[PDB]
Amino acid sequence: MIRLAEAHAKKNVVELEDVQEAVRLIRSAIKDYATDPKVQTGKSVIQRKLQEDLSREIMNVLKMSFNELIKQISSDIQEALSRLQQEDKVIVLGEGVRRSVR
């Protein structure tokens, strides 16, 4: 991982973005296995738990920008916002800030 992160920036220093890219290359081959070698919406929740997690911070504000939601709580973040928009739960109001339902 040291030579992989150093060759990505070859930049005179090693930034945090170069180290994160080296871990993805190592995890691409050593994963999906543990004690034995050899879908995620209902069985592995994630989508069911994120609907109550991201909306919890929005409801607490009314009692926000797209960059503030990440710092307070990013492919799954934008996917959860599009699900609530179809059910009339949130308001887009542009890409800058977000507005909750009245």
Binding site: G42, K43, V45, I46
Partner: protein
């Protein structure tokens, strides 16, 4: 009368009962023996939790399923097990051990996967 209430029964269960069915079906697609022990289901449930442990969205459920939101409660390793046995869905042999006890499915396998995808 011609309807089947087994499909709609698993869709209204809790997360602990739905996780036990999803863990049993995943073990059948790896070995293909129709006889998974009780020790393999426990190891498969913990394996799915530690998939994305570094993310804050998945660790919110680990504190409840293993500590119930309490620091004094230690990390745990029975309610959802005996519930499916009396409903005629899950089977369990007469064994005094809780690791090598085989678990078999009484209902069909095609109708069991439709309830997991509906959640």
């Amino acid at each position: 009368t011609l309807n089947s209430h087994v499909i709609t029964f698993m869709t209204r269960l809790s997360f602990t009962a739905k996780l036990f069915i999803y863990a049993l079906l995943n073990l059948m697609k790896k070995n293909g023996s129709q006889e998974q022990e009780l020790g393999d289901i426990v190891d498969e449930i913990k394996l799915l939790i530690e998939v994305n442990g570094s993310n804050k969205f998945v660790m919110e459920i680990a504190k409840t399923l293993f500590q119930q939101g309490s620091d004094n409660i230690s990390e745990q390793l029975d309610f959802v097990l005996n519930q499916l046995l009396d409903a005629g869905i899950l089977f369990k042999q007469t064994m005094k051990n809780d690791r090598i006890c085989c678990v078999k499915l009484n209902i069909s396998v095609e109708e069991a996967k439709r309830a997991m995808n509906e959640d």
